[PDB]
């Protein structure tokens, strides 16, 4: 039961279906009590019988509507379960990830399969807390909440943090994702080499893997928090370990376009 723009109040239709049900059920007893003409006792029991399903599941016998404005289906129960309005679609269309990031990608020529390159400005937010802590370890901040402030305005970030951000990262890796993830290669993991700008420097060889060219596709980065997760990620999911096709013998990372041209 929420508060919005001034008097504007928000609330799942469900509440209205319930009230309905309550007032009926209540008129029930109260009716029976005060003597009892048959026609009515049923009429009410009938109405009630309708209400009972209302919240349970609408449209399976009829559709009740909030007083005029929208002939909208007060979203009954299963409707939320099943996603009888794309709800399930968006549901199994995944949730959201706390430590995500999406940018534009760019070729990283002299890069190495093993690595990948994301912008600091990005990295900074990403493993933010892993940084806060390192922040307190170095003398660039005494305590957390404090350090937090340091990293709140771009202008107050001493050029000592970057060195700190470099630490955190060292060893660690992240995952990059393409638009339609069609196969396992669809997501691959690299140890980021902090770069400049606003762009994600991706390795040429893997462009075959992620069907991805460089005219404006954007990849997404994922941070594997868990010492366990990070652990698996940089062992069984690190690009440089999945050179062949799980679909057929043929290798996936192979000399492409320009490269061939030269050799």
């Amino acid at each position: 039961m929420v508060q919005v723009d001034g008097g504007r109040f928000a609330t799942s239709d469900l509440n209205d279906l319930y009230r309905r049900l309550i007032n009926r059920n209540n008129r029930l007893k109260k009716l029976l009590a005060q003597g009892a003409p048959e026609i009515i006792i049923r009429n009410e029991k009938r109405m009630l019988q309708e209400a009972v399903d209302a919240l349970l599941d609408n449209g399976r016998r009829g559709a009740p509507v909030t007083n005029p404005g929208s002939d909208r289906p007060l979203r009954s129960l299963t409707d939320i379960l099943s996603g009888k309005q794309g709800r399930f679609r968006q549901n199994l269309l995944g949730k959201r990830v706390d430590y995500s990031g999406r940018s534009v990608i760019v070729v990283g020529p002299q890069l190495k399969l093993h690595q990948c390159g994301l912008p600091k400005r990005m990295a900074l937010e990403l493993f933010k807390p892993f940084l806060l802590k390192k922040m307190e370890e170095k003398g660039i901040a005494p305590n957390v909440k404090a350090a937090r402030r340091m990293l709140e305005r771009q202008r107050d970030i001493k050029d000592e943090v970057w060195d700190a951000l470099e630490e955190v990262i060292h060893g660690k890796v992240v995952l990059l994702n393409r638009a339609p993830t069609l196969h396992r290669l669809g997501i691959q993991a690299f140890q980021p080499v902090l770069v400049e700008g606003q762009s994600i420097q991706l390795h040429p060889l893997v462009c075959e893997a992620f069907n991805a060219d460089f005219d404006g596709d954007q990849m997404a980065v994922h941070v594997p928090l868990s010492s366990f997760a990070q652990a698996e990620a940089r062992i069984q999911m690190l690009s440089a370990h999945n050179l062949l096709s799980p679909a057929s013998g043929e290798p996936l990372a192979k000399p492409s376009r320009d490269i061939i041209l030269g050799l």
């Binding site: 026609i39 049923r42 009429n43 009938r46 109405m47 309708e50 009829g62």
Partner: peptide
């Protein structure tokens, strides 16, 4: 099958 009529009918 749609309430209203039944009652309106049952009454009459």
């Amino acid at each position: 099958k749609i309430s209203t009529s039944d009652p309106v009918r049952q009454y009459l």
